[PDB]
Amino acid sequence: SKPTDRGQQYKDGKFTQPFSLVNQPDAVGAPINAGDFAEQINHIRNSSPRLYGNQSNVYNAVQEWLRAGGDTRNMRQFGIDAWQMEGADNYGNVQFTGYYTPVIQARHTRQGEFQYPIYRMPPKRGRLSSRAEIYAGALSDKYILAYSNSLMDNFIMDVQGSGYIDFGDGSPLNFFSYAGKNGHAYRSIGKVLIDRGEVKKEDMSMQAIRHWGETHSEAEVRELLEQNPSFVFFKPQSFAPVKGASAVPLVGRASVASDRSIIPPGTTLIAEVPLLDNNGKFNGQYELRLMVALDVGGAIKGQHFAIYQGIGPEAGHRAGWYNHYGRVWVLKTAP
Amino acid sequence: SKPTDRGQQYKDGKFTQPFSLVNQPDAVGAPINAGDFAEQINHIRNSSPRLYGNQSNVYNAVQEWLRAGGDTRNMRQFGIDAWQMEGADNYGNVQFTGYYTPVIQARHTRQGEFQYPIYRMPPKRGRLSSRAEIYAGALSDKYILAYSNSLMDNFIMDVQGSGYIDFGDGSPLNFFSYAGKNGHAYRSIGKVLIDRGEVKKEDMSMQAIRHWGETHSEAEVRELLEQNPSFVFFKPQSFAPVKGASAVPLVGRASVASDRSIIPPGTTLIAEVPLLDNNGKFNGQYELRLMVALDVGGAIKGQHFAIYQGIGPEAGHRAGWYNHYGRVWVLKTAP
Amino acid sequence: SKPTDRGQQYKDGKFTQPFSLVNQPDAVGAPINAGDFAEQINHIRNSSPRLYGNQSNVYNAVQEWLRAGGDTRNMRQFGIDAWQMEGADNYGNVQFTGYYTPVIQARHTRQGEFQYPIYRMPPKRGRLSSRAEIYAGALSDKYILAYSNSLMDNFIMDVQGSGYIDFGDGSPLNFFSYAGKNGHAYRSIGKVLIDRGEVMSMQAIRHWGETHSEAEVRELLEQNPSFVFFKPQSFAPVKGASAVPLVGRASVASDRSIIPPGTTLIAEVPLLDNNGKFNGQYELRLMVALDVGGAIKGQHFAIYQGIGPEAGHRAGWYNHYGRVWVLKTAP
Amino acid sequence: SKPTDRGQQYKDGKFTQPFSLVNQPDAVGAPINAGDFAEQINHIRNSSPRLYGNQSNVYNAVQEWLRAGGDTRNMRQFGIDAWQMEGADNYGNVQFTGYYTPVIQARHTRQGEFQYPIYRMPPKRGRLSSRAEIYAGALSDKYILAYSNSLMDNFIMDVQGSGYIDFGDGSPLNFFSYAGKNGHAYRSIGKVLIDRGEVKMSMQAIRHWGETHSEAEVRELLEQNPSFVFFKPQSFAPVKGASAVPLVGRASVASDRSIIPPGTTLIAEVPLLDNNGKFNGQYELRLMVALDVGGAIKGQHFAIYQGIGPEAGHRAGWYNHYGRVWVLKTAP
Ligand SMILES: CC(=O)N[C@@H]1[C@@H](O)[C@H](O[C@@H]2O[C@H](CO)[C@@H](O[C@@H]3O[C@H](CO)[C@@H](O[C@@H]4O[C@H](CO)[C@@H](O[C@@H]5O[C@H](CO)[C@@H](O[C@@H]6O[C@H](CO)[C@@H](O)[C@H](O)[C@H]6NC(C)=O)[C@H](O)[C@H]5NC(C)=O)[C@H](O)[C@H]4NC(C)=O)[C@H](O)[C@H]3NC(C)=O)[C@H](O)[C@H]2NC(C)=O)[C@@H](CO)O[C@H]1O
Ligand SMILES: CC(=O)N[C@@H]1[C@@H](O)[C@H](O[C@@H]2O[C@H](CO)[C@@H](O[C@@H]3O[C@H](CO)[C@@H](O[C@@H]4O[C@H](CO)[C@@H](O[C@@H]5O[C@H](CO)[C@@H](O[C@@H]6O[C@H](CO)[C@@H](O)[C@H](O)[C@H]6NC(C)=O)[C@H](O)[C@H]5NC(C)=O)[C@H](O)[C@H]4NC(C)=O)[C@H](O)[C@H]3NC(C)=O)[C@H](O)[C@H]2NC(C)=O)[C@@H](CO)O[C@H]1O
Ligand SMILES: CC(=O)N[C@@H]1[C@@H](O)[C@H](O[C@@H]2O[C@H](CO)[C@@H](O[C@@H]3O[C@H](CO)[C@@H](O[C@@H]4O[C@H](CO)[C@@H](O[C@@H]5O[C@H](CO)[C@@H](O[C@@H]6O[C@H](CO)[C@@H](O)[C@H](O)[C@H]6NC(C)=O)[C@H](O)[C@H]5NC(C)=O)[C@H](O)[C@H]4NC(C)=O)[C@H](O)[C@H]3NC(C)=O)[C@H](O)[C@H]2NC(C)=O)[C@@H](CO)O[C@H]1O
Ligand SMILES: CC(=O)N[C@@H]1[C@@H](O)[C@H](O[C@@H]2O[C@H](CO)[C@@H](O[C@@H]3O[C@H](CO)[C@@H](O[C@@H]4O[C@H](CO)[C@@H](O[C@@H]5O[C@H](CO)[C@@H](O[C@@H]6O[C@H](CO)[C@@H](O)[C@H](O)[C@H]6NC(C)=O)[C@H](O)[C@H]5NC(C)=O)[C@H](O)[C@H]4NC(C)=O)[C@H](O)[C@H]3NC(C)=O)[C@H](O)[C@H]2NC(C)=O)[C@@H](CO)O[C@H]1O
């Protein structure tokens, strides 16, 4: 059977095809984020008018379904078709990970605890340098945007793709969007902790990496972070909503990152997101949510989704545990 | 015959107790404002430490319930007891009105279209003057805060209790909170219009009032508005969140105004809010929302609630329609 | 023949060259916007690190001058030069015009008074359409950003190059930066008002629009075939060509060929009342060239007034002259 | 016996009165903060039309003078009466101190480095507790507004009278205004370290001391000041003082309302000092308005409002010098 150690349900049948057109999905009650789904869609209308035009009828259809009852048994009653996904094992288990938008403090000039530079997009040959070399000073100081008080925060923000920069002087939070990356492949840092016997395999998470950095010295932290030759460059947007690859403001848990080749942007997705406590342990229950694919990821390929948790600490704690599975139905309207 | 033109529903029977302990509420699905409610709780937590301290048990219970997918049936596992309100008709149906926070365009000094003063709290004897007298100049110019471009906007804001003031110069919107009122009783203008013979009986709305003001001249608008001797004074909070009587930042459609004697502040309320189109016509469907009583009103007494729609024009259009009914349950703890 | 209405000077003599190095400028005394200038300096540091690197010396040179005091007679003790610019009449009268960042209210969807679209950058062939054609609907609705309540406001913002958009719903003001323009040359509106004779400034044109009907206003505005496209920066500071946040009356638009960006300029800006009449007195200010303009060529500057109505009233009247010195480091 | 190390002078002559009508001010230069001064008048015109309504006569005179060049040699041509103040030494030099509005980062709930509570106005009997007792938990947790990451920052903000609170979550900076104080007299930590023999006082030097020593050592030192200030959140409102008028950086000062009432225009020779707070020897001409008060600001003494932020704090902590000042009024 499918060990539910990471949330693997099997109460639907046996659907192997990519888009398994089921009559109506397995679920009790209405989705938890109905009104929240409306906001997400509204953003698609103003931020991507061409993407909205292609999915107008789809969005308008599910809205009435939510305003009437919301039960996954009253979908076809409005011409909505649920196309279940095969997932990993092809039995019905789609991978679910998570990411958020962290807020970090920094200064325009280095001072005191602020000695860690955040770089912008450099020239063609400047993007060749690895993370370790950049730490040593491979890039010119004119490409620095700010200096943070934590090398770990910069690394986490690097992994997330973006983040708000708080200068702590009164000015609004500047959104440092994903502008580009260096010519080096991304390599797992948490794995390096397991390679030398520093962190447990079963107890691998966001809090473990952060706790490790506080337990060890700066030299030991820098050495570990350098094991990831990849480095991300940002572009200041100045208090703009969190936007992904689709250039549409992402809403907390109402949007996900996907493989554009399989699941294109603007795709409505209803899924059973597995719940977990503060310790990230799978309790056994799920959560019905309506989300839209509006972002991409280097590690997000095939039957895999990256649920956008939100902005802030609480959104980060919730995002670090997500490496579970669950079912998902691609919602399409009848022609 | 049982009226259903407004938005009444008779199927849960007649309730004798002001609060009938019904296990599972007659909900259509799940809370569509999980994020709005959670936000509202966090606002009470940081703005009203003692009010939150007492209702914290309920707040943590309903949030954990919302986490479980917001299952209106499984909420009993969390010990959440639903006490359905008897309603104004004792059939579970309760009156639902609405108010919002209008954004008024103004200037510090009178110029061009900006010739309508917004006053602050004057001395004891200055608060005796009626609206008509204040329009003629009963108050000193040193009590003026700003000059708007519409007498109708000032009147609507007066009725709402507060509103944001946009100076259109780059500076943030200043929140003019309810500071006080004059020594004259309030008299509805909607009644005056019907009785005057201009506006029709059933064809009354806050929209028709705004349209009427644009159809008629300044002298005709002023004369009509003077039929309401009451006048509200404001106090600029300088870009502060919209706060009500409880001094807690109000969240759009996640908070309501109530009679503190019957429904005290901090009370969690799950309700079936009747939906209505752009023309304010009751289509027939409802909406499940979790709201908290955090404000009061002069016309809000007994079995009656004033749903805080939000900030802006869209929030105003949605607010100036509500004179309908719907079911509501007062969420509490064990008996 | 020999006017002094626009603040023209003669008390300096003819200038035989564009820039003349003096010793103690003919200015009044101490600058008023010493603080605003400092705010402009760090803005260049944060925004354009390359520009701040080449002019770091100049910014710090004048930084010590104002720190102590700010007397125009004594500047050499801080290592500063004073290259006095000439003018049209060659008497040091540098032309000073003005522009600001207007705040226009609008919604995402057309409703009521909001029926005037604000467009973004369309494709290559979509940029060929003239203003009159775009008004009639030459561009697709998917290129619309917002709908304003005034066609005149959209036109003024079009002329200014940018503007803040207030959606009146609580959300922050979205800065619609200059993204591009259409394939048509700019035509003057006052020009058309002279043809049939009806009227002069940005204040006189605004009054004309209020006096005449919508059909008469649209017809006049269509006389300018040029149309500007914007790009929402989502609540970002007002930036010009140099991509540096502009500070009110502490920055100006110039001809990059003559006066390159990052150049410090101390000038005697001619004052004027609410009616735009030159009273006779000047104002000493320190400003930096951080923007450009299509009509800003040669010995001419466009003083950035600021954001809002008051900044617009002040900018619409500005078409006067004044002296200006290019502050550089002593060799 | 005439000191000059702290900015004091003698080229003005000894005074016989607090204020004296001077036909021509003994100071060369021009108001280098004319823009900041004009900004203050607009703030007094919007935030307090009552005080402005009776102080306009002086502003209109100092504005007409400013617009018409701004040369101190023509002030009488606009109706501006200069009044030389004696200060500490009857030679025209007044004691100039400074304060600013610190931006502190804090959270609504205690977590990690954020373990230092910022309290609001408690009941009558709750205001009796001293700082040391409050640190130990004399006040209930329901009176806490936020938890900062530095006990020193809280102390400095306490001395300043107010400060902006940055929650680092996106929300605007909340201005914690001076709501009240406890029933204990203020004791400067400066006098403590001066007597202890650990000074090279400098209110910023103590900041370095706090970072050098541990939490227990910092708390112990701070407990020497029994006074404790309570704040009131205004949520992104301009820095306002006692006059309830938004203060402008170095264009406003705190004064003794009995001697120098609020709304009073003051032109002064503010003594300049380097990064190390050493008096170089030069001054600075500034136009300022009295719009705030202070417990230690009595008689011939002013507290120059430096501004908001770190740089404003470094500049403020050094001020303990002297300089000449003229009370600008109208000519009868
Ligand atoms: C040891 C170990 O392995 N532990 C595991 C741990 O790693 C796991 O944690 C999670 O890991 C995953 C994978 O490592 C992390 O995944 C992140 O996912 C996010 C979102 O999916 C990624 O961020 C997005 O990245 C894409 C690029 O791939 C961005 O897309 C780009 O967007 C820009 C605009 O910003 C586009 O540029 C614009 O282009 C237009 C058109 O050409 C042009 O006009 C504009 O000018 C231009 N704008 C600019 C500024 O240039 C660009 O075209 C587009 N690129 C593409 C290809 O479309 C997107 O914007 C990013 N989204 C946001 C938001 O910023 C992120 O890259 C990815 N990281 C990695 C390393 O892959 C995940 O973050 C992480 N989560 C957490 C909490 O740590 C955990 C799981 O919990 O498991 C452990 O076992
Ligand atoms: C025929 C029919 O059915 N017609 C329908 C029509 O009625 C509907 O339209 C709606 O009508 C209703 C009724 O006319 C309108 O109701 C409005 O509701 C709002 C919110 O409930 C009211 O605004 C609140 O008013 C209360 C006072 O009553 C305010 O509370 C005060 O708050 C201040 C602080 O702001 C407190 O002062 C502070 O006190 C503390 C402690 O003492 C002190 O320390 C502070 O210093 C001090 N602060 C200051 C600044 O002084 C004060 O104590 C407290 N007062 C009390 C008693 O507690 C509260 O703040 C207001 N809320 C907000 C937000 O501002 C409003 O007054 C009320 N209007 C009227 C006329 O009663 C409703 O607005 C309207 N809606 C619309 C859209 O028009 C329509 C709707 O569709 O349907 C028709 O069918
Ligand atoms: C009858 C009569 O004549 N009456 C008089 C009346 O006309 C007078 O009114 C005044 O009129 C004048 C002239 O009509 C108005 O002048 C305006 O002046 C402003 C400021 O100088 C101009 O706005 C600037 O325009 C330039 C382009 O010309 C903009 O520069 C561009 O900036 C963008 C970024 O925003 C750059 O793009 C970026 O490029 C980088 C690098 O390649 C790339 O990486 C980025 O991605 C890219 N970003 C984007 C978004 O694309 C671009 O490269 C650059 N262009 C160049 C060439 O460098 C600049 O940003 C604008 N500034 C601002 C701020 O937006 C404006 O164009 C100009 N209007 C006209 C029609 O020429 C003046 O405004 C007006 N004043 C008033 C008050 O009405 C009155 C005087 O009051 O007197 C009557 O008598
Ligand atoms: C060894 C040694 O001596 N070393 C030196 C060292 O000491 C020096 O450091 C400096 O020390 C001095 C003195 O200790 C510090 O001076 C500070 O100065 C500031 C400004 O002058 C003071 O802050 C103001 O305090 C007043 C009260 O005194 C506040 O005024 C109150 O404002 C509130 C509103 O906020 C009013 O309440 C309102 O009232 C109305 C009407 O009744 C009501 O309607 C409202 O509801 C109500 N609002 C509320 C919220 O309740 C209230 O009425 C009014 N009070 C009065 C009496 O009018 C004012 O708001 C504060 N200003 C700001 C801004 O907040 C501060 O108290 C004072 N500190 C002390 C300890 O006295 C100075 O800060 C310090 N500087 C530094 C850098 O440390 C250094 C200097 O370099 O030199 C060493 O040598």
Residue A172 at interface with chain C, using a CB cutoff of 8 Å: yes
Among residues B294, B303, B308, the alpha carbon closest in space to that of B326 is found at: B303
Which residue lies with its CA nearest to atom 68 of ligand 4? D294
- Nearest by CB to residue C233, choosing from A141, A142, A238, is A238
Closest by Cα among D171, D179, D20 to D91: D20
Q: Neighbours of D (≥3 Cβ pairs closer than 8 A)?
A: A, B, C
Rounded Cα–Cα distance for residues B130 and B127 (Å): 8
Task: State whether residue D78 sits within 8 Å of chain C by CB.
Answer: no
Across the interface, whether the CB atoms of B166 and C164 are under 8 A apart is answered: no
Fold adopted by B103-240: Ribosomal Protein L25; Chain P (2.40.240)
Amino acid, res. D183: G
The tokens of A119 are what?
């770089």
Pocket test for ligand 1, best of A296, A318, A325 (most atoms within 8 A of CB): A296
Nearest chain A CA: its distance from B71 CA (Å): 7
> D332 CA to chain C: closest CA distance, Å?
27
Preceding-residue numbers of gaps in chain A (C–N over 2.5 Å): none
**Partner D contacted by C33 (CB < 8 A):** yes
Ligand 2 centroid–CA B41 distance in Å is: 21
C30 touches chain D (CB under 8 A): yes
Nearest CA to ligand 4 atom 66: D161
User: Would you list the DSSP string of B196-256?
Assistant: HTSS-SS---HHHHHHHHHHS-HHHHHHHHTT----EEEEE-SS---B-TT--BPPTTTEE
With beta carbons less than 8 A apart as the criterion, state whether C264 and C326 touch. yes
Burial class (CB in 10 A: 0-12, 13-18, 19+), B51: buried
CA distance C132 to B274: 46
Cα distance between residue D28 and residue A90, in whole Å: 87
Neighbouring residues of A24: CB distance < 8 A, sequence distance ≥ 6: A72, A73, A74, A75, A76, A82
Q: Which atom of ligand 2 is nearest to the CA of B244?
A: 60
What DSSP string describes B278-300?
A: TT--EEEEEEEEEEEEEE--TT-
Smallest Cα–Cα separation from B186: which of B229, B134, B133, B155?
B229
Cβ distance B109 to B70 under 8 Å?
A: no
Residues of B in contact with C307 (CB under 8 A): 169-170
Helix (H) or strand (E) holding D45, with range, is: helix D34-47
Give yes or no for residue D290 CB within 6 A of ligand 4. no
Residue A244 C-alpha from the chain's centroid:
9
DSSP output for D186-238: ---HHHHHHHHT-----TTHHHHHHHHS-HHHHHHHHTT----EEEEE-SS--
The single residue listed with the structure tokens 């997009």 is A121
Burial degree of A111 (CB within 10 A; 0-12, 13-18, 19+): exposed
Q: If you measure from the C-alpha of residue C229 to the centroid of ligand 3, how many angstroms do you get, rounded to a whole number?
A: 12
C192: Cβ below 6 Å to ligand 3? no
Tokens 């402009």 map to which residue? C40
CA dist D278 and D312 (Å) reads 16
- Report how far residue B286's alpha carbon sits from residue B275's, in angstroms, rounded to the nearest whole number: 5
Beta bridge pairs of residue B146: B118
Query: Could you identify the residue written with the tokens 């005034």?
Result: C150
- With an 8 Å Cβ cutoff, are C30 and D29 in contact? yes
Which ligand 2 atom sits nearest the alpha carbon of residue B188? 14
Q: In this structure, which amino acid lies at residue B155?
A: F
The neighbouring-strand residues paired with C92 are none
- Residue D160 CA to residue D174 CA, distance in Å, equals 16
Mutation to test the C interface, candidates D28, D32, D63, D288, most C Cβ within 10 Å: D32
SS3 B195: helix
Closest by Cα among B78, B72, B93, B119 to B5: B93
User: Rounded distance, CA B18 to CA D301, Å?
Assistant: 66
Token look-up 């101390």 returns C266
Residue A66, class by beta-carbon neighbours within 10 Å (0-12 exposed, 13-18 middle, 19+ buried)?
Answer: buried
Per DSSP, the residues of C121-143 read ---GGGGG--HHHHHHT-S-GGG
Best CA proximity match to C224, nearest among C186, C251, C191: C186
Going by the DSSP 8-state scheme, the letter that residue B42 receives in this structure is H
CA distance A289 to chain C (A): 27
The whole-angstrom separation of Cα D158 and Cα B273 is 48
Residue indicated by tokens 């409610």: B37
Ligand 4: nearest atom to the Cα of D177: 35
Letter string b/e over residues D88-115, b meaning 16 or more CB atoms within 10 A of that residue's CB:
ebebbbbbbbbbbbbbbbbbbebeeebe
Q: How far apart are CA C161 and CA C149, in angstroms?
A: 19
Tokens at D196, concatenated: 């202890």
The residue whose CA is least distant from atom 20 of ligand 2 is B297
Q: How far apart are the two ends of chain A, measured CA to CA in Å? A: 38
**Strand intervals (E) in chain D:** 19-22, 80-85, 93-101, 103-107, 116-119, 144-148, 163-166, 174-181, 229-233, 252-254, 265-269, 285-292, 301-308, 320-330
Q: Is A104 exposed, middle or buried (0-12, 13-18, 19+ CB in 10 A)?
A: buried
Integer Cα distance of C217 and D222 in angstroms: 69
Structure-block tokens of residue A141: 């100081």
Answer whether A28 sits within 8 Å of B71, measured CB to CB: yes
- Distance (Å, whole) CA A134 – CA A124: 15
| Closest approach atom of ligand 2 to CA B243 | 64
C-alpha dist (Å) from residue C2 to C77, C91, C94, D33, D108: 38, 12, 16, 36, 69
Which amino acid would we find at residue A267?
T
| CATH tag for D103-237 (out of 1.10.3720.10, 3.20.20.140, 2.40.240.50, 3.30.1490.20) | 2.40.240.50
Name the one residue in this structure whose structure tokens are 């264009």: D251
Q: Where are the alpha helices (DSSP H) in chain C?
A: 34-47, 49-54, 56-68, 131-136, 151-160, 189-195, 202-211, 214-221, 309-317
Residue with tokens 């103690």: C24
As a whole number of angstroms, the distance between CA B31 and CA A287 comes to 13
* CATH, domain range C103-236: 2.40.240.50
Chain A hits for B69, CB-CB cut-off 8 Å, are 29, 32, 275, 285-288
| Residue C174, token pair as written in the block | 């979205």
Q: Is A323 in the pocket of ligand 1 (CB under 6 A)?
A: yes
- CA–CA gap between residue C162 and residue C240 (Å, rounded): 9
C-beta atoms of C28 and D272 within 8 A: no
Asked if residues B100 and B160 have their Cβ atoms less than 8 Å apart, the reply is yes
Pair D108, B45: CB distance under 8 Å: yes
Residue C60 vs residues B289, C41, D310: alpha-carbon distances, Å? 60, 9, 20
Angle at C290 between CA C289 and CA C293, to 5 degrees: 90
Best substitution site from C187, C203, C230, C292 to test ligand 3's pocket, by max atoms within 8 Å of Cβ? Answer: C292
Q: Do the Cβ atoms of B38 and A32 come closer than 8 Å?
A: no
Q: How far apart are CA D279 and CA A230, in angstroms?
A: 51
Closest C-alpha to A271, from A242, A238, A305, A239: A305
How far apart CA D239 and CA D48 sit, in angstroms, is 14
Task: Give the helix/strand (H/E) hosting D52.
Answer: helix D49-67
Query: What letter would DSSP give residue D132?
Result: H
Please answer yes or no on whether B168 and C310 come within 8 Å at the CB atom: no
Is residue C209 a contact partner of residue C155, using CB atoms and an 8 Å limit? Answer: no
Judge residue B315's burial from the number of C-beta atoms within 10 Å of its C-beta, 0-12 exposed, 13-18 middle, 19 or more buried.
buried
3-state secondary structure of C106: strand
For the stretch C199-205, contacts whose Cβ atoms lie closer than 8 Å and that sit 24 or more positions apart, written own/partner, are C201/C276, C201/C316, C201/C317, C201/C319, C202/C156, C202/C159, C202/C312, C202/C315, C202/C316, C203/C276, C203/C313, C203/C316, C203/C317
The approach used to solve this structure was: X-ray
CA–CA gap between residue A139 and residue A119 (Å, rounded):
9
The rounded distance, in Å, linking the Cα atoms of B93 and B329 is 11
Ligand 1 atom at minimal distance to the Cα of residue A160: 74
Q: Where are the domains of chain B?
A: 18-102+241-335, 103-240
Quote the Cα angle for D48-D49-D53, to 5°: 130
Beta-ladder partners of A96: A305, A324
> Touching check for A241 and chain C: CB below 8 Å?
yes
**CA dihedral sign, ordered D105, D109, D112, D117:** positive
- Name which of D32, D36, D272 is nearest C30 (Cβ-Cβ): D32
| Ligand 4 atom 49, closest CA | D179
Q: How many residues does chain C have?
A: 331
Ligand 4 atom index nearest CA of D292 = 21
Cα–chain-centroid distance for residue A105? 22
For chain C, positions 83-112, list CB contacts with chain D under 8 A: none
**Domain range C18-102+237-331, its CATH number among 3.30.70.270, 3.40.50.620, 2.40.40.10, 1.20.120.160:** 2.40.40.10
- Ligand in nearest proximity to the CA of A102: 1
In this complex, do A67 and B275 lie within 8 Å of one another by their Cβ atoms? yes
CATH 2.40.40.10 given to domain D18-102+238-332: yes
**Is the CB of D308 less than 8 angstroms away from the CB of A170?**
yes
Helices A218-225 + A206-215 axis angle, to 10: 140
CA–CA gap between residue D59 and residue D40 (Å, rounded)? 10
SS3 letters for chain A? CCCHHHCCCCCCCCCCCCEEEECCCCCCCCCCCHHHHHHHHHHHHHHCHHHHHHCHHHHHHHHHHHHHCCCCCCCHHHCEEEEEECECCCCCEEEEEEEEECEEEEECCCECCECEEEEECCCCHHHHCCHHHHHHCCCCHHHEEEEECCHHHHHHHHHHCCEEEECCCCCCCEEEEEEEECCCCCCCCHHHHHHCCCCCCCCCCHHHHHHHHHHCCHHHHHHHHCCCCCCEEEEECCCCCCECCCCCECCCCCEEECCCCCCCCCCEEEEECCCECCCCCECCCCCEEEEEEEECCCCCCCCEEEEEEEECHHHHHHHHHCEEEECEEEEEECC
Kindly state if the Cβ of C102 falls inside 6 Å of ligand 3.
no
Least distant ligand from the CA of C317: 3
In this structure, is the dihedral angle defined by the CA atoms of residues C284, C286, C289 and C290, taken in order, positive or negative? negative
Q: What CA–CA distance (Å, rounded) separates C65 from C77?
A: 8
Q: Does D118 touch chain C (CB under 8 A)?
A: no
Q: Which CATH class is domain B18-102+241-335?
A: mainly beta
H-state helical runs in chain B: 34-47, 49-67, 131-136, 151-160, 189-196, 206-215, 218-225, 313-319
Owner of token pair 């950058």: C121
Distance CA C45, CA C55 (A): 10
Strands C144-148 and C116-119, sheet pairing = antiparallel
For residue A295, report the distance from its CA to the centre of ligand 1, in Å.
8
